[PDB]
């Protein structure tokens, strides 16, 4: 039964559940809030099969809200703070939302949204103009008819539907990666997506969530020492900022058992630097919206240069194959599409079987990534499938070219893209972020690529840029970079 997940999380909640700016929230008090919010949502006439769209910051009540939405047999639809109003609004409609719950601090955006899309019930976490204040008896669970816990939105936004079973499996995966708890887990990523699942993993294992509204290196350092945090999750760029910060050696981070980073391709040289400066606590995570968790790179893995280009070994119960355009399994060392079968994979795109069937086949999920396994069974990603540069029936993997460029001491980041060319097939182009106050020779960089990879991989055009543009999700916006060179 689908209510098993929400109950698992509830069941786990320990003495102290959340800490933040304002101070601590006991297990008791959080449990109470779930019951409260659950009852209020039930009473407001929200039926089991439907979604509850939620717009909030990184607050402890938002932790309760997700759990309440799931407990009452609904599917949580976390509205991403970085997303545009038109994307958020499309998401509310497509997810079959029976409600919009929002926090006062984002009433402006809530109003904006409600001009664009209609919704039966509009509720708010505290007094507000545009909605009814929920905050004014045991937890009464209902079952989602189709067992969905979460719908999270991605060309054009698809809604990834994750089962209650899949989210339960994620707890087991989290334990297998992060240690037995309790964890004091610092979460500065938004509670609307992975952040919110990590909070649930943390609660379920008897730990304490430590919330920050945003990432600042000073604040994270301070928080780790002050709350004696054991775990934290960072975007790769945040890792680099934290590791390179001047106050790091001054700070006491002896409490850390895991500094977790992922969600975007890592710069090997910057990771190596972080591994040196931060010690044996570095762990990388690889997943996708469709796949959830796939692989992790341990702190001991980070002590082999050869593995700094890897995502790591697949997690327990995660089957991975490398496959050709046809669909046949390739040998170790060969490069092809990464396919995944696991208890954590999506059920499908919400109310879209046509698109789902292009991505699932035989219980296997097409990640959209391309890569290969090494002799010791670590997965190495060479590219997003859309980012491969084809020259006359040869594959140039843009990440391999970036790795070489970024190894140069005067280069911090690189985005390599192809643009079409009749005489070269496609022309390799590189946007490069330079170090500090450095001024490397484009030709040295071309020469470096030429020595390591060969003639075809060498970028014709090299542009120095202040930063690599990112998507709202925080990934390299390689469609933007592509436009710079057309």
Ligand X SMILES: Nc1ncnc2c1ncn2[C@@H]1O[C@H](COP(=O)(O)O)[C@@H](O)[C@H]1O
Closer residue to ligand X (CB): 265 or 459: 265
Shortest CB 451 distance to ligand EQ2, Å: 32
Q: Does 178 bind ligand EQ2 (CB under 6 A)?
A: no
* Three-state secondary structure call for residue 166: helix
- Helix crossing, 4-12 with 194-204: angle to 10°? 60
Q: 292 touches which of ligand X, ligand EQ2, none (CB within 5 to 8 A by kind)?
A: ligand EQ2
Shortest CB 309 distance to ligand EQ2, Å: 17
Q: Hey, which residues does 349 pair with through a beta bridge?
A: 160
Q: What is the DSSP letter of 450?
A: H
Q: Does 263 bind ligand EQ2 (CB under 6 A)?
A: yes
Question: Alpha helix locations (H) across 289-421?
Answer: 353-356, 398-407
Measure the CA–CA gap between 461 and 225, rounded to whole angstroms.
Answer: 45
Among 24, 251, 289, 424, binds ligand EQ2 (CB under 6 A): 289
Shortest CB 258 distance to ligand EQ2, Å: 13
Closer residue to ligand X (CB): 40 or 232: 232
Q: Name the nearest CA neighbour of 448 among 416, 399, 401, 485.
A: 401
Q: Does 315 bind ligand EQ2 (CB under 6 A)?
A: no
Contact between residue 71 and residue 38 where contact means Cβ atoms under 8 Å apart: yes
> Is 480 annotated to bind ligand?
no
Binding site for ligand X (CB under 6 A): 262-266, 284-286, 288-289, 311, 367-369, 381, 384, 473, 475
Q: Which stretch binds ligand EQ2 (CB under 6 A): 34-42, 70-78, 284-292, 315-323?
A: 284-292
**Alpha-carbon distance values, 262 to 200, 272, 301, 318 (Å):** 18, 15, 15, 18
Q: 265 touches which of ligand X, ligand EQ2, none (CB within 5 to 8 A by kind)?
A: ligand X
> Is 437 annotated to bind ligand?
no
Measure the CA–CA gap between 289 and 151, rounded to whole angstroms.
Answer: 10
Measure the CA–CA gap between 393 and 383, rounded to whole angstroms.
Answer: 17
Measure the CA–CA gap between 383 and 366, rounded to whole angstroms.
Answer: 14
Q: 381 touches which of ligand X, ligand EQ2, none (CB within 5 to 8 A by kind)?
A: ligand X
Give the distance, in angstroms, between the CA of residue 154 and the centroid of all CA atoms in the same chain: 11
Q: Does 253 bind ligand EQ2 (CB under 6 A)?
A: no
Q: Name the nearest CA neighbour of 399 among 327, 449, 469.
A: 449
Among 18, 71, 94, 170, binds ligand EQ2 (CB under 6 A): 170
Q: Does 383 bind ligand EQ2 (CB under 6 A)?
A: no
Q: For binding to ligand EQ2 (CB under 6 A), which residues are involved?
A: 170, 194, 197, 262-263, 285-289, 292-293
**Residues in the annotated binding site for AMP:** 263, 285, 289, 369, 384, 399, 475
């Amino acid at each position: 039964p689908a209510m098993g997940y929400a109950r698992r999380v509830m069941d786990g909640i320990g003495e102290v559940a959340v800490t933040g700016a304002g101070g601590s929230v006991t297990g008791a008090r959080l449990r109470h809030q779930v019951r409260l919010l659950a009852h209020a949502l039930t009473e407001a006439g929200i039926p089991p099969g439907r979604g509850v769209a939620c717009l909030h910051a990184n607050t402890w009540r938002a932790i309760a809200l997700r759990l309440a939405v799931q407990a009452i047999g609904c599917h949580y639809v976390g509205l991403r703070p970085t997303a545009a109003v038109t994307e958020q609004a499309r998401a509310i409609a497509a997810a079959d939302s029976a409600a919009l719950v929002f926090e006062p601090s984002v009433e402006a955006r809530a109003a904006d949204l409600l001009e664009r899309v209609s919704v039966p019930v509009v509720l708010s976490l505290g007094p507000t103009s545009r909605g009814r204040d929920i905050l004014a008896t045991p937890l009464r669970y209902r079952e989602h008819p189709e067992g969905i816990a979460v719908v999270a939105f991605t060309g054009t936004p698809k809604g990834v539907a994750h089962s209650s079973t899949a989210m339960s499996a994620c707890v087991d995966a989290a334990v297998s990666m992060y240690g037995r708890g309790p964890w004091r887990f610092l979460i500065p990523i938004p509670l609307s997506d992975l952040g919110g699942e990590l909070a649930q993993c943390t609660l379920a294992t008897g730990g304490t969530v430590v919330l920050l509204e945003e990432f600042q290196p000073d604040a994270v350092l301070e928080a780790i020492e002050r709350e004696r945090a054991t775990h934290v999750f960072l975007a790769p760029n945040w890792l680099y900022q934290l590791a390179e910060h001047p106050a790091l050696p001054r700070s006491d981070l002896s409490s850390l058992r895991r500094v977790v980073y992922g969600g975007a391709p890592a710069v090997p040289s910057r990771v190596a630097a972080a591994r040196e400066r931060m010690g044996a606590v570095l762990m990388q995570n690889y997943g996708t919206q469709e796949a959830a968790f796939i692989a992790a790179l341990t702190p001991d893995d980070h002590a082999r240069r050869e593995l700094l280009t890897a995502v790591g070994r697949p997690l327990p119960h995660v089957e991975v194959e490398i496959r050709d355009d046809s669909g046949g399994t390739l040998p170790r060392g060969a490069v092809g599409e990464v396919w995944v079968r696991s208890p954590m994979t999506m059920s499908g795109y919400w109310r879209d079987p046509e698109r789902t069937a292009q991505v699932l086949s035989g219980g296997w999920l097409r990640t959209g990534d391309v890569g290969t396994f090494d002799e010791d069974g670590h997965l190495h990603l060479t590219d997003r499938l859309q980012d491969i540069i084809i020259v006359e029936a040869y594959n140039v993997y843009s990440r391999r070219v970036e790795h070489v460029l970024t190894e140069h001491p005067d280069v911090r980041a690189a985005a390599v893209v192809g643009v079409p060319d009749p005489d070269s097939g496609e022309a390799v182009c590189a946007a490069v972020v330079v170090a500090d106050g450095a001024d490397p020779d484009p030709e040295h960089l071309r020469a470096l690529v030429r020595d390591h990879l060969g003639d075809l991989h060498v970028p014709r055009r090299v542009e120095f840029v202040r930063s690599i543009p990112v998507t709202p999700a925080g990934k390299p916006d390689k469609v933007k970079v592509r436009t710079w060179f057309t």
